[PDB]
């Protein structure tokens, strides 16, 4: 329906016979996991590889020109999760804090007070 | 087909209790009472034994192919 339905992704080779997708890109694709089939095309030249990497890349398509607002967001369980996470009466013990901090790829290695 | 060897959920052996279950049901015992007497506590094994349908007899009713 729109340009966000066809985007450039980075390949990660994995076992089993299903395409794996992040949960935040389902809404622009308008897809669920009840039996949807999706297509993949491989460029065969350096110029088209650069075109895909610099024009059709997924991060460049976060904000859409239709309504100058993002089309990808935190959805489904994660959304519910953060509503249960940022409550005023939620407290975390030290070991779980260390595990969660290590789970952050962009963590700077400093434990907050 | 035939009674499964193990329970699907936990893995308890239930393939040797089919004849005992049929014998208990033959003598007028209730299904719950028979399942209790078969020492099936968790309801996973209870639904494994109770909901099984014996289709092996229907296939055996046909004449042998060879």
């Amino acid at each position: 329906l729109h340009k966000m339905s066809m985007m450039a992704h980075r390949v990660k080779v994995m076992p089993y016979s299903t395409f794996r997708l992040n949960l935040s890109v389902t809404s622009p694709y308008n897809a669920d996991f009840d039996g949807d089939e999706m297509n993949l095309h491989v460029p065969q030249s350096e110029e088209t590889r650069a075109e895909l990497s610099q024009l059709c890349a997924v991060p460049l398509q976060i904000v859409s020109p239709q309504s100058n607002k993002p089309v990808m967001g935190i959805v489904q369980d994660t959304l519910c999760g953060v509503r249960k996470m940022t409550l005023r009466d939620t407290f975390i013990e030290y070991e779980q804090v260390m595990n969660m901090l290590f789970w952050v790829p962009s963590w700077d290695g400093v434990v907050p007070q | 087909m035939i009674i499964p060897v193990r329970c699907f959920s936990c893995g308890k052996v239930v393939g040797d209790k089919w004849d005992a279950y049929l014998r208990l049901l033959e003598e007028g015992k209730q299904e719950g009472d028979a399942l209790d007497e078969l020492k099936l506590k968790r309801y996973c094994c209870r639904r494994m034994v109770l909901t099984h349908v014996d289709l092996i007899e229907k296939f055996l009713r046909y004449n042998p192919l060879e």
Binding site: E46, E47, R49, A50, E51, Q54, L55 | -
Partner: protein, 84 residues
Amino acid sequence: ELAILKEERTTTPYLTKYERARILGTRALQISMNAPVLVDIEGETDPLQIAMKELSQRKIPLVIRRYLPDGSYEDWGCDELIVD
């Protein structure tokens, strides 16, 4: 005749996304076809990364010919177009 003088160019002095992608692809293909490199190579092996490094230092030897709707064109060097 159809060319436009350097002092009369009215197009934007910035590098558009389409122009950037086309130059990056062309430079990557040329580097993959054994072309001389105008910047040092430390550890990178991808021709696209080499092209991006050349673009950052403004050393790509290519010229963009922007076409006006009438037919006239403006020639902009890759070393004079501002890259964000």
